[PDB]
Each structure stands twice: as C-alpha cells, then as structure tokens.
Design a protein around this ligand. Structure first.
Ligand SMILES: [K+]
Ligand SMILES: [Mg+2]
Lengths: 77, 97, 214, 244, 124
RNA sequence: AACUUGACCAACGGAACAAGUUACCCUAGG
RNA sequence: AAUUUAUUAAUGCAAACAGUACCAAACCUGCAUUAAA
RNA sequence: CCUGUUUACCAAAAACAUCACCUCUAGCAUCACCAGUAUUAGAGGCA
RNA sequence: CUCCGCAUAAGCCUGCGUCAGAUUAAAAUGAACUGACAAUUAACAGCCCAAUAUCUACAAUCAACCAACAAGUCAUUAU
RNA sequence: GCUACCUAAGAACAGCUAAAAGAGCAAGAUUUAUAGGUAGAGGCGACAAACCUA
RNA sequence: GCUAAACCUAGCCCCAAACCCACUCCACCUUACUACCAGACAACCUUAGCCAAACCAUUUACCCAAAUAAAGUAUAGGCGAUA
C-alpha cells in the first residue's frame, strides 16, 4: 500500500546517541553547562520543559481524549 | 590487516628525533595481507558437553569462527588462560580422588 | 532555497493538491532529465491504487458507487470518484466505467471462477483464467503498480499452485501470488494513442521543452 | 620580528595557563606522553643494527611508522589499532610506471561483546585483528584494561576503560546486585587494574572534556560579601573582647 | 554600486525591509490577527516623578562651599555604617548568632523580591 | 657460477618508454 | 598516440557467514581479470 | 515534413527545434524520471 | 514642442528649500558646489495570527445559453 | 542583480478579417516585474560550439 | 617675470630583549551591529602542480628541537638530472 509523504520531507531522525550513555556508571560530559552547542562534547538530554503558567498566545491544548466533552460514540454534525 | 612497506629508503633521523618524510616516502607496496593466510585454531577449555568434545574441562582446538560465535558467548567454553587451566585441573584431580 | 519535494502530504484526501514542477532537476538543482519544463499548472488528485481497502471499522468485501468519471492531467488514463460508506476516493477508471455504476472490491477466492465484471477487484486466483485485468500488484497489499496506463490490459494466462501468471502489456510473463488483487477490464481512454499532437506548441503545454543533444 | 617561543611549543605553553594548568597532574602527564603505538600496518626491524648486503658494513636501522588515518567512525567502534592507509603505489609494481593514489581500508564486522565488569552487551564494529587481540587477552574486559590509549585508537574503547576502571575503583555494588558472591569474584579477577577512583575519573577524557569537567568542579556561586564581612567583624570583636 | 560604508537603517531597502527594522525603541506590546497592535500597559515605562514642592536643592551649588576629598563608596564602608552597628550591639548582648544574618538585612536569595540586585530586573 | 652474450637503438653520439587535428584557436619572435 | 586503471561498473578468488556426506545470503574489505569514462 | 527559433532581414538559405514517423533500452515506487507504470518513461534518427 | 505627463513599485539617499559665499555652469541672476539653518507628522504602506484534530470532486471566461482542453489563484468544522 | 535554462508565486497584450486563431494586417513555442536554483575537471544551451557581469 | 624650485621631519627597516591582545553603558550569526518563544546544520579524510632533467613519462622542495664537525662522506637515483 502506497504511503503518503516522502521520506525527504519527513523530519530527520534523531542522531545516534553518544556511546558514553551506553556504559553503565559513566556520566557523559556534555555542553549543557556551557549553554551552547560544541561539536567536541556530547549532546545533552534535556527534560521536557513546561512553561508553568498560562500564556494565551502560546497556549497548547490537551490531548483530544482528555477533553472533558470527549465521547466514545461519534456524533455526525 | 594490510601490511605495507616504502619503496624509497628513509634517511636516519638520529637518536631522539623523528624522520623527515618527503613526498616520495608515501609510495608503498603491499607486503602482505593477513586475511590471506590459513586460519589457526583457538584453544578453549569446555565448561559443558559439546557434540565434538563432551568431556568437560577438556582442551580443544576448535575453529576460531565456531568458538567465537557459539562456544564463548553461550558459556559452553572458556579461554585457555593460565588461571583457567589451574581451576579445571583441580576438578580433574578431585574427580579422580 | 534548496529543492524541497512537494510530495509532503501525509493524509489521503480527494481534494486536488497543488504541485511544484521540477524542470528536470534533482534536489541538487542540476538537470537530470532533459526536455522537462514549463507547461500548464496542474493539481494532483491522490489516486488510490489499493482497490481493496475497507474502511477502518468495517472489514471484508464492500461495494462502491461511481460518482464521477473525469479527466486527469497527471496521467493518460481517466479517473473515477467512488463513494462507499462514508468514504470517497479516486481510482483508475475502466473502459466502460460510468457515473452511477456500482463496483465491488473483494478479497475472497471462490471455489470456482467468479463471473468477470468490468471494474470489480477480486484476487487474481479468483479471477477466471484468460480475463483482461488491469492495476495488478506484485505482492499482496502492495498496491497496483502495473497496467495503469490508458487502454492497457494484461491477461491472466494460468493459475498454478497458489500463483498466477499474467501477461503484461509488453507481452512479458509475470508471476505473482494468487492473493494479489487486480481489476477486471481495460483502462479508460483506449483511444489515447490515436490522438495527434498536431502542433509543436502543444508539447510546451504538456511541460516538455526543447531538448537538443548536440 | 621573532616570537619568544617556537610556534610548535605554543600548545605546551597553553597547558601552563588558566584552566589547563589546574587539571590534575596525573591527567596532564597522559597528554604529555608520546608512546609509540604497536606496529600494525608495517613490519618492524628486528634489531637496532643490520649488516648492509651491498657493502657488508654494519649500519644503524630505524623503524619509521606508516601514517595511519582514523576516520570518525572508528572512534565509535574498536578497530584494534587498524586504520585507513593513505599513500601511493606504482602501477604494476614498476617504479618507471605512473604513480597512482591508493587507499587500503580494513575489513569491518559487526559483533556482540559482553563486559563482565559492566555486565552489558555492546554492538561494536571490529576488524579481525581486534578479535584476535581479544583472544590473546582472554576476554574483552582484559583487552580494554590491558591495552594502552595509543594501541586502542578508539574513543569508545577509552570510554569503556573509564567505565570498567571506575567500577573497580568504586567497588560498585550495582554489578550483579542479587549475587554479591559473584560480584566479588569478578572484582578479584581484575584487582590488578584497580586504580584510585580519583585518577580513574580522568581516564580517556579529551582535553575539551577534561577542561569542561574541571570548569564544572571550579564553578561556584560568588560568596556574598555580607557573609565575609560578618566573619571579619565577629573575629575583630572577639579579639577586642579578649584584650579587654 | 551599493553603498557599503553607510549605516544600514530602515529607510533603505524595499517595503518589507523598511517595516521590519526600527530605530531602537523598545516594544510595548504585540501584534494580533489583522495586524492589530495590542499595547500592554505594564510594558509601557511608568515615569516615577517626585513632588518637588518645598525642595531646597537647585541645579547648581554656590561657589562658597568647602571643597572635600573624594571618597568613593565601597561595600566595606556600607557594611561598617549600615550593618556593623546592629551586630556590634547584639554581640555585646550575646543575642547575635550566625543563623540570624537576615535580622541585620542579609538576603539569602534575590528570588521573590520586586527589585532584585542580580540579575538586575529594574530600570534606572 | 664464471668466462661471456644481447636493441635495423637505421632519426645509426643512440631520451627507458608517447599520434592526429585547430578554417574556434591560445602564447612566442622574426 | 603512448602511460595508467587510482576511478566506476562486471566477474573470479580469498575474507566474513550457516546448516543437512556436501553445500550457503548480498553487502563489506583485500587481490586479480575484461570493460567503461 | 507540419510549424517554430536562429544569422540575415523584403528576405532568401542553411542550421537547430518539432507534430507525425522510425528504431533503441526499461517490469518499477517514497528527492529527478514520478507521487508516473509499456496507449508509460528515457535515449537516438528522421533528406 | 510635447517625445510626454502624474502616481506607485524598485533603486537611490538630502542631491536647484531658506540664508550666506571669495566656490561653480558659456554665464564677474542661476547654482545641482561649499558653510549654516530648516524639513517628510498616518488613515496609505510595511510590520500579522493560540493549540489539536478535522474539512476542502464541480475552473476561469459579464457565467447565463451553446462549448470545450493545455484541466485551472481564491472555502472548513469540532473542543 | 548580465546572460542561458529552470522553480515559486504574479502581470501585460488596441483595432481590423474575425467560423479558425493567428507574429494575418496591425493571446503566444509571446513578453515581462519579483524572489530562488544550477559554478569552471563545471553549469546552461530550439548547438552559434554560443553564453555564464570584459 | 611667471610657472616653479629648494627643505626635514612624519614615520619606517633590520636586530636585540621580552611569550601579546581585548567585558563604561547599549547593539550585533535574522537582511550582523535588530530588547522579548518548543532547538536540533554540525568539525576531523595523503596538498597539488611545478621550479629542473634544456622535451617528457619515475625522478627534485617547502617542518619536527644544539652553532660547529663528521660530510657533501655513507647512501638513494631514467645510477641521469639530482637528492
Ligand atoms: K538619492
Ligand atoms: Mg493601515
């Protein structure tokens, strides 16, 4: 079955993580402390960020199922 | 492992000095390729029964491909280290006792 | 800005999609295929080539009604808007496909050869031996990639041990599993070849610029 | 005009200034050392002296290593010292013939290796030489610990050494949590390589990684002068009270 | 032919360039749909002007004034004049204890203050 | 092994080993 | 025209790999062989 | 053997392009060809 | 005489406004050169938009009739 | 930023025969503004071996 | 008699010795010098041709830590040039 959306237009897959993460008991030295990217240090893993307050112009709505009015039975409008 | 040698001689650098290499010293000739050589057996001490050598604790000269792929990862065999040889030797002695 | 393919839509729709011409250039911006350039603006109609694609909740064979048969600028064959259940899609139109007709798409192989009806889609194994077929897929569920041009039709020569042998329009034998869906009949616009371009200018309208080898 | 120091010494001068100077002395030595890697792509001369056949005279002979190019991919894997050989050859092995550019690449394979100290399985790219080297060392953990940095020629390999070395130095209970007896057995087998935890931390780090690690250690918030002055005033008051 | 040396400003370039570039004025709001500008009152700087009635200081100083030596203020001098007296009294009375630095005006952190010294969050 | 031998290298004092074409021509002085 | 096949494809060998006496996946690397440009 | 560009221009001529015509290669999809599938696509010749 | 002209866009960047000049054009009033002073004020224009899913087969041409082919700039709903 | 080709999204074209629309006289294989792409072992070329800021 | 002529400083050169640089405020990788929104592009890979061989086809040079000497010696090289 032909799938729609060519690979070239889809977001590039994440780069391969540094192998220092694989090694147990080792803390990869990253550029998070520098506050900018450098090619010679490992890429940091950042925890998901939340604004912590309401900003109408940058609002994100919850998942559709979580909506209070979500119903399992569809309605045709 | 490709092994090469230089066509042109390199003049002696002297004690505590590194040779000065000119453009001619980059020309090489292929002395030998290690892959094109008869394979050698890998000595292993078996820790479990195997169709070829059921005898546990028996030194075997299995093919390197077979030993690496199956015997060593699965724990059927262990390397023929001096330390390992002593440990199994005692079992062969204790069993007779 | 570097070349970005227009083929970025991920969700199927019957709405014509705006296309971007390439001019014979690849992503590097260098000409790869010569003689391609300009022409009339064209919108893409997402043609569904997996004839047997039941709706999300529903399963098994289903029927569709031919709402419309119309010209397609992106291909030689004509296309048909078919409505089944609550879903519409674009398919390739057979020689005698007409508005209002009902067509059947089934993935069931009967004990014998079911009657051949133009525009229906059954598994090759179910289709009678020696029937004109179109829009055949190489693998079960891959989707029709062959016999898709106007007026083209392959024949089902024989079925042997769970496989089917079909003659492609180039008179070449092709062997596929018997669970491969296909469409009975010839493709629309059987008289496509007869048409004469007549005027050099018409070639430019079709997006084909002069190509001088030397 | 002339520079005070030769330009080739400027790098060493950098290590005497700023953050680089504050790096541990043991780590700095590793950078200064210039050990010769084991011959891989050439055959070394057996002795210091040889008898010249042409004139029958004893003449000094020196080993000149072949320049090896290590692509970035090799740093992820373990190639056992092998690398690309970028040079030239004579067509049909004839000096009179045109000189042609030539590259000799190693044969790479994907293999699975299990580290007893780390108790993990790794998928790494290796050559046949790496497999042979592991056999002569009786296991990956021995090969990684035994081999020096110049021989390993791999950033991943030096990263593994820090992992294994830190576990031995820290006596980490995380290895085989349910079986303390098994944990002790593995640690006993590698006791020789156990080095202090302080030194083990800086094993295999690059200069950039070491500088960043030292920057984080040094990084501290400035102390408010309110706290500093309070300590001085209280000390002055106490001394004044003592004199009284 | 283009003038490289001259200062780049919003007067130059086509309509898109001229609109986007400004002259350094601080924004006081945002743009909504339809290019409607919404002005945020808080963003607008509020001028805090005092009451000058009955104020004796004037733009200039009389020339008949005793010249004095210039002594720039320092952190130590401020501590000796604003914080040292309170600690000195408490130390004699024994009430003073390190844990209670805040009693003399020490701020462990700037968080939660309207005017935070570092990072400075207030205008001159 | 030695003693020795070998290019019509004939453009014959012999470059170890290489042609056409340019009326699209490029450079050089006479 | 001579020089060359570094280069690109094609094939062979070795290399790697597995299974029920006898044979096995392309890729990859090394070495050959004609071609291509 | 249709018309179109080209130097020239009233222009002629030739060249190239090109409708038609002819042979040649190709049984297939997620960056060109092409979101196409031999009534297709590409490469040539065409007096 | 009109060959244009006015405006916008693009470009340009104060480049015939006032005052003064010993500077300048063939021209010791003019001045586009020099010094000083002044100036173009937003309604036009630029500068835009919360999220997630979902919707979008029917050209344009006075769009009606008769037609086509090279098959087309123009649209949502739910929370 | 010239020019050649191409991409995106624009724009222009009086009258006359006027069925047919067509460089007919005077709506096209036309012209044209904007932004972008293809770079010298190359690009582009209805191929002059031309053009790619002389 | 005009046009002109004349000038002595600005600095500069080569050495020696010493290892240099740089956060008033504000602005500056977007169309730099532009107060203020969900990133993700990431660096590493033989210098080449050619001075010459009176052509050119292998062949010559530009770095690796002490002035001098060993020594233009050993040695390499169409064993030629030359190194
Ligand atoms: K101007
Ligand atoms: Mg407005």
């Amino acid at each position: 079955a032909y799938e729609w959306g060519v690979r070239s237009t889809r977001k590039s897959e994440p780069p391969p993580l540094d192998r220092v993460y694989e090694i147990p008991g080792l803390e990869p030295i990253t550029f998070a402390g520098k506050m900018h990217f450098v090619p010679w240090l490992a890429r940091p893993i950042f925890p998901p960020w939340d604004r912590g307050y309401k900003d109408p112009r940058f609002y994100r709505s919850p998942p559709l199922h979580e909506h209070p009015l979500y119903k399992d039975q569809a309605c045709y409008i | 492992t490709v092994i090469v040698e230089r066509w042109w001689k390199v003049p002696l650098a002297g004690e505590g000095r590194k040779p000065r290499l000119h453009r001619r010293h980059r020309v090489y000739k292929l002395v030998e390729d290690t892959k094109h050589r008869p394979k050698e057996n890998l000595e292993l001490i078996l820790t479990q029964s195997v169709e070829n050598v059921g005898v546990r604790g028996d030194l075997v000269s299995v093919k390197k491909s077979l030993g690496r792929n199956r015997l060593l990862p699965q724990g059927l065999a262990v390397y023929a280290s001096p330390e390992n040889k002593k440990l199994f030797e005692e079992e062969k002695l204790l069993r007779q006792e | 800005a570097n070349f970005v393919s227009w083929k970025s839509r991920t969700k199927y729709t019957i709405t014509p999609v705006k296309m971007r011409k390439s001019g014979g250039r690849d992503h590097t911006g260098r000409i790869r295929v010569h003689g391609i350039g300009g022409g009339h603006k064209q919108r893409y109609r997402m043609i569904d080539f997996l004839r047997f694609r039941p709706e999300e909740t529903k399963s098994g064979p289903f029927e569709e009604k031919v709402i419309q048969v119309r010209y397609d600028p992106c291909r030689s064959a004509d296309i048909a808007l078919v409505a089944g259940g609550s879903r519409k899609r674009w398919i390739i139109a057979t020689e005698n496909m007409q508005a209002g007709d009902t067509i059947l798409n089934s993935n069931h192989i009967g004990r014998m050869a079911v009657a051949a009806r133009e525009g229906d889609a059954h598994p090759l194994g179910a289709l009678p031996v020696g029937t004109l077929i179109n829009n055949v897929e190489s693998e079960p569920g891959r989707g029709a990639q062959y016999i898709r041009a106007a007026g083209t039709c392959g024949v089902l020569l024989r079925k042997v041990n769970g496989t089917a042998i079909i003659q492609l329009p180039s008179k070449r034998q092709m062997q596929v599993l018997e669970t491969c869906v296909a469409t009975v009949g010839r493709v629309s616009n059987v008289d496509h070849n007869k048409r004469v371009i007549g005027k050099a200018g018409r070639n430019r309208w079709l997006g084909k610029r002069p190509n001088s080898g030397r | 005009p002339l520079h005070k120091y030769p330009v080739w010494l400027w790098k060493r001068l950098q290590l005497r200034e700023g953050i680089c100077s504050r790096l541990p002395g043991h780590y700095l030595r590793s950078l200064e050392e210039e050990r010769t890697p084991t011959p891989v792509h050439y055959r070394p001369h057996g002795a210091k002296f040889k008898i010249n056949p042409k004139n029958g005279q004893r003449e000094r002979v020196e080993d000149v290593p072949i320049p090896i190019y290590f692509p970035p991919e090799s740093q992820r894997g373990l190639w056992g010292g092998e690398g690309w050989i970028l040079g030239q050859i004579y067509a049909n092995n004839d000096k009179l013939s045109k000189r042609l550019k030539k590259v000799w690449k190693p044969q790479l394979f994907e293999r699975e290796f299990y580290s007893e100290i780390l108790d993990k399985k790794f998928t790494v790219t290796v050559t046949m030489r790496t497999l042979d080297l592991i056999d002569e060392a009786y296991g990956l953990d021995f090969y990684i610990l035994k081999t020096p940095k110049e021989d390993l020629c791999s950033k991943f390999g030096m990263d593994l050494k820090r992992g294994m070395l830190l576990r031995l130095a820290r006596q980490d209970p995380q290895l085989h949590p349910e079986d303390p007896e098994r944990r002790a057995a593995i640690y006993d087998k590698y006791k020789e390589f156990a080095i202090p935890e302080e030194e083990a931390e800086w094993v295999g780090l690059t200069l950039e990684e070491a500088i960043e690690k030292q920057r984080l250690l040094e990084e501290k918030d400035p102390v408010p002068l309110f706290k500093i002055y309070v300590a001085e005033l209280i000390q002055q008051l106490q001394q004044q009270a003592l004199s009284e | 032919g283009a003038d490289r040396m001259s200062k780049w400003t919003s007067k130059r370039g086509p309509r898109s360039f001229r609109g986007r570039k400004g002259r350094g004025a601080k924004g006081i709001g945002f743009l909504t749909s339809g290019w409607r500008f919404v002005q945020i009152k808080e963003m607008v700087p509020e001028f805090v002007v005092p009451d000058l009635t009955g104020f004796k200081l004037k733009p200039y100083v009389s020339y008949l004034a005793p010249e004095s030596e210039e002594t720039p203020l320092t952190a130590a001098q401020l501590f000796s004049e604003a914080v040292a007296p309170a600690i000195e009294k408490d130390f004699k009375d024994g009430t003073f204890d390190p844990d209670n630095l805040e009693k003399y005006g020490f701020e462990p952190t700037q968080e939660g203050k309207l005017f935070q010294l570092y990072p400075r969050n207030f205008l001159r």
